[PDB]
Design a protein around this ligand. Structure first.
Ligand SMILES: Nc1ncnc2c1ncn2[C@@H]1O[C@H](COP(=O)(O)OP(=O)(O)NP(=O)(O)O)[C@@H](O)[C@H]1O
Ligand SMILES: *[C@@H]1[C@H](C(=O)OC(C)(C)C)C(=O)CC[C@]1(C)C(=O)OCC#C
Length: 337
């Protein structure tokens, strides 16, 4: 078994020439060569079975990404795991190989306005498909926006994704921290707005240290919530918390982004709206004048049908989640069904 930084990558003989390329809180990702198809791939090793929440992430990512097929969404090419459930300790997810992610690119490079507009267009194009399947990604951030040499962008990391039905916190919408319930497609648009702001200045717009600090960052730029804003917070204890904060004036977007295109700041304003019911929707954002050079509805496909898991996962024990992961990956085993 090939080894990478002291870690077993048990993916041969088909996949060889492994090279470390990144890592998140759950998976180690390596580049590799697929000797069967004669193509470069990425391989994510995850080891989730001792944790119920990690098992949920693994099953959600596998189920959603095998059902999605879109240019701006990473696909799963193959899944490697042991032939028996008792031997199964790691899962390897094989994906198309991307060259970097937006987090790493922003560390090294200031983006031009054409770059920002193009990246923002691809994010929203992929998000249009996700939302059209009635799915929430729920964890959009620069590190899960993959990029290749030709500037193509793919969204990845669907372990928190959920059917819509009303690590880092810097991109979490305010209602996640205040309501803990009733999440809509609106939460992804907030994340995209945070990403846009970071592309405009190469710094995160709301880099809070904890939920309390996070809310103070957001309010220190948006200003204290309006009465209509307050009425959309359902948890009254959370409303009382907001009402206990000192008044804060809104900071004009062109104070934060003085050289930014005014059309980008108009869209940004509509994405980073406190009230999720007033926040711009993905199709309206695609149609905003900022993206006029790219917007092409006939070339922005949607899902044939809304997605559904066919079972609630939140309450299942991890040993049951393990059996579901085994079942869901059987289609990549020789001799399946
Ligand atoms: N298909 C891929 N091609 C190239 N690099 C990739 C690919 N998938 C992931 N990466 C890199 O590996 C990192 C970790 O992947 P990710 O899927 O976010 O792992 P995770 O641990 O399951 N979740 P998280 O903690 O949210 O990052 C990414 O941020 C990328 O830099
Ligand atoms: C795209 C690249 C790019 O995708 O970065 C990596 C590191 C993946 C090669 C850039 O960020 C700069 C050049 C380019 C082509 C770009 O942004 O131009 C398109 C336009 C307008």
């Amino acid at each position: 078994p090939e080894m990478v930084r002291g870690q077993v990558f048990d993916v041969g003989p088909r996949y060889t020439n492994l090279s470390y390329i990144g890592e998140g809180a759950y998976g180690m990702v390596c580049s590799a060569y697929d000797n069967v198809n004669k193509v470069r791939v990425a391989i994510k090793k995850i080891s989730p079975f001792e944790h119920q929440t990690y098992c949920q992430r693994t099953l959600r990512e596998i189920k959603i990404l095998l059902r999605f097929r879109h240019e701006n969404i990473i696909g799963i090419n193959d899944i490697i795991r042991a032939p028996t459930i008792e031997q199964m300790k790691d899962v390897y997810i094989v994906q198309d190989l991307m060259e970097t992610d937006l987090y790493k690119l922003l560390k090294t490079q200031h983006l031009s306005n054409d770059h920002i507009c193009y990246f923002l267009y691809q994010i929203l194009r992929g998000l249009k498909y996700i939302h059209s399947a009635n799915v929430l990604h729920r964890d959009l951030k620069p590190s899960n926006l993959l990029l290749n040499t030709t500037c193509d962008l793919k969204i990845c990391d669907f372990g928190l994704a959920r059917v819509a039905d009303p690590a880092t916190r810097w991109y979490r919408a305010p209602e996640i921290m205040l309501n803990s319930k009733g999440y809509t497609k609106s939460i992804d648009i907030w994340s995209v707005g945070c990403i846009l702001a970071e592309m405009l200045s190469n710094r995160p717009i709301f880099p809070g240290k904890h939920y309390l600090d996070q809310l103070n960052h957001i309010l220190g730029i948006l200003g204290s919530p309006s009465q209509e804003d307050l009425n959309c917070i359902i948890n009254l204890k959370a409303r009382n918390y907001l009402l206990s904060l000192p008044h804060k004036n809104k900071v004009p977007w062109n104070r934060l982004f003085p050289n930014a295109d005014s059309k980008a700041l108009d869209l940004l304003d509509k994405m980073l709206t406190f009230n999720p019911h007033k926040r711009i929707e993905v199709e309206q954002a695609l149609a905003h004048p900022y993206l006029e050079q790219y917007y092409d509805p006939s070339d922005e496909p949607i899902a044939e049908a809304p997605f559904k898991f066919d079972m609630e996962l939140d309450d299942l024990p991890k040993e049951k989640l393990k059996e579901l992961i085994f079942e869901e990956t059987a289609r990549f085993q020789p001799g399946y069904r």
